[PDB]
Design a protein around this nucleic acid. Structure first.
Lengths: 109, 285, 285, 109, 109
DNA sequence: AGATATATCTACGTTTAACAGTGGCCTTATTAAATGACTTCTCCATGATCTAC
């Protein structure tokens, strides 16, 4: 695979780890009740991502989600590559990549 | 002698949600596509302006075959046998059965947004409590001026006097199909570039171009003027009117430029009256 | 001698849907194919421009064997026997009824789109709540400058004076077959590259290239300028006019390049007048 | 390649080193067996970064945070480039870069 | 290029040289093996910069800081430009530039 | 006049804490083409027979 495909794969894994962190925070914060909302959280995440209309707002939401996730091993191993990929590539393609990562989220067994 | 009327008029500044494309999700996608400089520009369908002119003709006498109900939201045909000799609608816009099929006297181009469209989205909710799938929705708008190009073959009209009502309607265009309830956008024009010549050669395409990202200055162009300076598009055949006149009169060396000796009227009504007089004199009406 | 006229013409910028191919489902696909760099471009067929030239010759008052009844939308033959001596269209465009056939002086190629086709589409729908199978539809459109190549043989014309009306028609081309109701695209030239030589070899075919993949820039191709530099394609036999003249004059070292000593005119009418004078002098007209 | 991207990457590194300095400061401040607040500090930093109302706001905060970081070598190497980048550029893009840096400091530790 | 950014950079250099002079002064003040207070001095400088209430406040402060810095060669060659830049421009912008200079002096030594 | 050691006062403390949205919805209808055309000519192979040398 070419370099761009590797960068895209690391971005997918980075987003998945960020969602791992956010879902862990949701589980910890709302342990009360029968079950915390995750399916509703996933639907809200999709709605927020589709809400973004230009590069500025979408990049703001993406960065905010990334920081909210926590430590990001995939984003640890690759700083400059993923940072340049985020800054350079058009925000729409980033939206496709984020949605694909959302749909590809492997639950922790 | 053959005669044609080519023109490109510019709308006023305001919000626009006139031509929703597909409504992908909750977002009623305001239809858009690439334009000058590779920036995404929102579009207003030319069929929308044709429908607006049809409605204008129907509203004020002017027998038309297709009557818009305004109550049942349906179109009624007075006579299925289209007769361009009598109806204004058939004579002007043409028809197709699938007979004569006409050709249409009026040729329209899709209206383009003079400014690129970034995201311009808007929320929508339905009161409070008891919320269903229809409660939350989005609508795209656009705060620009729209520009479109049109052309009529004068000779091709069955009744030569029918050119006057279309000019009156373009000057007084009714609501163009769109979200008038939420985004009431008047499509009346504020700057006109009309040419009335006897050969098909039709410059003055979408000349109005200002870019200047998010603004409302609406400068005329550099290429159109270039053309005017070079020698073609003779000023005697050009008609410019509207707010663009104010910008034009402030250009340096305007007194010596060939653009000066063109028909320039700051008021739109005066220029339209003069053009109507010229057309009536030329066509023998 | 054996004089020929070759030219590559570029059109203005606008929305065009002139060459719908066989439609699929609900969408009316406009014909497209591959071109430079492997990107899909939209094509307007040469038969359309030949029909436009025929219509121009009919309208200007020349004989024209094939009469096109606009109201009937039908084509009629003035005489069943083709007479290239008397009829301009039979002289120029040729015929084959199946003498019997003529080679035809005018040889024209397809009209390619200078900018690659992204895939922009437009939705159209019949108004009113009463909706049927023919309610909504999609029409494909393209915002591009179109470029086509043509070549004529002056000697092959039965009457040599017939070259003048064809040039006038090219510079004043009537509507090219398309959808003028919703995409009225003027095909009038705005930049020419004409060659009038006694040798046949032609190096001006599709000499136009885009600066950016989505833009209305229309700069001259590097190959054409380089070939003029190298020594062939004599500048004395070159004729360039239109909007590209400005870009050529803004080039560096232009006063030293061989492009300087070639016939270049900002106004297209002046260049056409000069070329017509040269042709009339060369062919004894 | 594309020296603007180089400046953006070195700014990311500068912000990371400044946050490293502030982490060292808070680790020095804490005493006894109390858990040094790092997750709390990171969340506080993110919340204050999101809170901003143009130009003076969040630019004063950026400068103050960089000063709090202390000695930072990446900013030492390149003075004029980073100074012009901070003075110029819309503040929202600087916020995007800083947030990224929040998510991309964690590679260091 | 962009002469106002030239003034901004020479202001950065002037501030750095003035704080170099102040650091030399305080190094001269201390004696014997006690660690000269410099990180504490940097913190004090930042805190005093942050404390201000527009116009006269922080302008008397910047003038006094430049005076206590000593002789500034860059200020000597650029008297008029520096003075005009200081007199004009919002004082918050000058404080931001000064904080950037606070973080910009380390490559000097 | 050249070479050399010395002297220059503040300063410090520069926020400690707790939170970084709690809810509900994430389009409801309808239409998913309507027509007609789907090459146009010629260029045949072979043997019997006529006819000129």
């Amino acid at each position: 695979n070419s370099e761009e495909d590797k960068q895209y794969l690391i971005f997918i894994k980075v987003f998945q780890q960020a969602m791992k962190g956010n879902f862990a925070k949701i589980y910890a914060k709302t342990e009360e009740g029968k079950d915390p909302p995750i399916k509703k959280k996933v639907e809200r995440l999709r709605a927020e991502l589709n809400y973004c209309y230009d590069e500025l707002s979408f990049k703001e939401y993406l960065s905010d989600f990334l920081v909210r996730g926590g430590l990001n091993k995939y984003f640890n191993e690759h700083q400059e590559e993923i940072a340049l990929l985020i800054k350079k590539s058009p925000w729409q393609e980033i939206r496709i990549w984020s949605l694909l990562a959302i749909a590809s989220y492997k639950p922790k067994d | 002698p053959n005669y044609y009327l080519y023109g490109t008029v510019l709308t006023r500044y305001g919000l626009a949600s006139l031509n929703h494309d597909i409504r992908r999700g909750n977002k009623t996608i305001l239809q858009k596509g690439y334009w000058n400089n590779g920036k995404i520009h929102s579009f207003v369908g030319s069929s929308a302006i044709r429908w607006a002119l049809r409605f204008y003709l129907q509203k004020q006498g002017y027998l038309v075959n297709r009557v818009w109900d305004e109550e049942e939201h349906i179109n009624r045909l007075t006579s299925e046998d289209f007769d361009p000799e009598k109806f204004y609608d058939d004579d002007i816009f043409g028809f197709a059965l699938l007979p004569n099929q006409r050709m249409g006297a009026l040729g329209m181009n899709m209206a383009v947004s003079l400014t690129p469209y970034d995201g311009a989205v808007k929320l929508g909710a339905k009161s409070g409590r008891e919320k269903d799938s229809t409660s939350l929705h989005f609508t795209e708008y656009h705060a620009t001026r729209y520009q479109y190009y049109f052309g009529i073959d004068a000779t091709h009209l069955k009744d030569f006097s029918r050119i006057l009502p279309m000019i009156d309607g373009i000057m007084n265009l009714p609501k163009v199909g769109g979200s008038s309830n939420i985004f009431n956008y008047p499509f009346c024009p504020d700057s006109l570039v009309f040419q009335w010549t006897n050969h098909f050669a039709s410059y003055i395409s979408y000349c109005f171009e200002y870019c200047d990202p998010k603004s409302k200055e609406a400068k005329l162009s550099q290429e159109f003027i270039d053309e005017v300076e070079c020698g073609q598009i003779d000023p005697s055949k050009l008609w410019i009117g509207g707010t663009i006149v104010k910008d034009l009169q402030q250009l340096d060396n305007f007194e010596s430029s060939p653009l000066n000796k063109a028909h320039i009227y700051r008021n739109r009504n005066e220029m339209i009256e003069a053009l109507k007089t010229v057309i009536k004199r030329d066509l023998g009406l």
